[PDB]
Design a binder for this molecule. Structure first.
Ligand SMILES: C[C@]12CCC(=O)C=C1CC[C@@H]1[C@@H]2C(=O)C[C@@]2(C)[C@H]1CC[C@]2(O)C(=O)CO
Lengths: 221, 211
């Protein structure tokens, strides 16, 4: 029923500007006070901006310092946030929220739109197959992997055999390494099925419009 | 600047236990709210106006408090309760930093596996040695790397998964990244997992001059 749908986030250089939008559905948008709340990489939640139902009453969080402008167009059921002179500390997930009453709990939240403030440029990942090699296993099960290295920004999506190997999979949170992201994913299958049955990791990086498959092949020793 | 602090930052309990967490304010306020968040989704209104339950919230949850001290309580906790809970109030810029409630389960030793650098990565001039420590509990585990018998500490990055939503185990990767040239100057690579499930580590290793 009620939907709040954000857009406009992305990579922006320090000192740049951005306008975020929040499309509302399923309720009388103009009867509700609205807010923007952001969650930093440290998971800290900060109340950025608040706007009354009629658009005539506005508040900002403490570090905003005039660089943010909340506005709304009740005729198009859309909330906006203009962001300028952006700094590294403004990197966060930006959420559109709706207020219930005048104690100001937030009874509906959008899905979030991610803003990343840095000088880094979009970079596709290198993807490397992780076969046991000289570390050969010998149990009833075998574990294989894929190393995804050197991409920006987050995220990538990893699947195995196009999602048909879904159980036995661990895709680890990415970490920054030389200011680019790296993660690995592991999959575990019966050792009787590999290499007789192919195993392939499927890596997608939407920001770079890249899709790579890496077949896990036994190494040529 | 009225500020909120939450205690504890992290806590774990078996299903069936009573759970209490606290939200403290630097000066007196009223009508405290609590939001629930799970990985990869938005915060969700959970308790509002200090004691009112949001729609969909089981009666096992209750909120209470006044002045500078507020609390969220759960009776007979259930696995689906695991989440981070954040407090917030209408005059506060920064939400409380959250209490992450995790699920206690039976101890489990990791399944450990080690991978030499791929030839494709070596072609590019880098060398990552990857060790997976999968499906263990509790979260606290120690990984040690030994290269030709001497402990190595530089160039290791570890990454833990969020608690697993079906079996409540954790998994972690430990990755040793070296230049190709440094990798090529040594032979024995060992990943050692020390976990409270045993006094003896789990050891996986390889020689680079094989394969
Ligand atoms: C309840 C309140 C004051 C009364 C009102 O008509 C509407 C609001 C909602 C927005 C609130 C505001 C404040 O009380 C000051 C807040 C909390 C602001 C959002 C950010 C804020 O400006 C701060 O973060 C100040 O530190």
């Amino acid at each position: 029923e009620v939907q709040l749908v954000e857009s406009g986030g992305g990579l922006v250089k320090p000192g740049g500007s951005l306008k975020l939008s929040c499309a509302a559905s399923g309720f009388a948008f103009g009867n509700y006070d609205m807010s923007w709340v952001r969650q930093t990489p440290e998971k800290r939640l900060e109340w950025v901006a608040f706007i009354g139902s009629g658009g005539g009453r506005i508040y900002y969080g403490d570090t905003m310092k005039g660089r943010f402008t909340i506005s709304r167009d009740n005729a198009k059921n859309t909330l906006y946030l203009q962001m300028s002179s952006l700094k590294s500390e403004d990197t966060a997930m930006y959420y559109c929220t709706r207020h219930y009453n005048y104690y100001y709990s937030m009874d509906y939240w959008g899905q979030g739109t991610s803003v990343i403030v840095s000088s880094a440029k979009t970079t596709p990942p290198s993807v490397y197959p992780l076969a046991p090699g000289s570390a050969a296993q010998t149990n009833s099960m075998v574990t294989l992997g894929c190393l995804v290295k050197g991409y920006f920004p987050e995220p990538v999506t990893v699947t195995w055999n196009s999602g048909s190997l879904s159980s036995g999979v661990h895709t680890f949170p990415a970490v920054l390494q030389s200011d680019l992201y790296t993660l690995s994913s592991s999959v575990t299958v019966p050792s009787s099925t590999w290499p007789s049955e192919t195993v392939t990791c499927n890596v997608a990086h939407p920001a770079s419009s890249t899709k790579v498959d890496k077949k896990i092949v036994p190494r040529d020793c | 600047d009225i500020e909120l602090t939450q205690s504890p930052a992290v806590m774990s309990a078996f299903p069936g236990e009573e759970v209490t967490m606290t939200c403290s304010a630097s000066s007196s306020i009223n009508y405290m709210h609590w939001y629930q968040q799970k990985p990869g989704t938005s915060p969700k209104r959970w308790i509002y106006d200090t004691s009112k339950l949001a729609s969909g919230v089981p009666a096992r949850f209750s909120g209470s408090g006044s002045g500078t001290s507020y609390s969220l309580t759960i009776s007979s906790m259930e696995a689906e309760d695991a989440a981070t809970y954040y407090c917030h109030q209408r005059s506060i810029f920064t939400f409380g930093s959250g209490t992450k409630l995790e699920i206690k389960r039976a101890d489990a030793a990791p399944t450990v596996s080690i991978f030499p650098p791929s030839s494709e990565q070596l072609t590019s001039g880098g060398a990552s040695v990857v060790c997976f420590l999968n499906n263990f509990y509790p979260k606290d585990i120690n990984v040690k790397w030994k290269i030709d018998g001497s402990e190595r500490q530089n160039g290791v990055l570890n990454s833990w998964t969020d608690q697993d939503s079906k079996d409540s185990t954790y998994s972690m990767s430990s990755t040793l990244t070296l230049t190709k040239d440094e990798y090529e100057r040594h032979n024995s690579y060992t990943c050692e997992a020390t976990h409270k499930t045993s006094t003896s580590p789990i050891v996986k290793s390889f020689n680079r001059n094989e394969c």
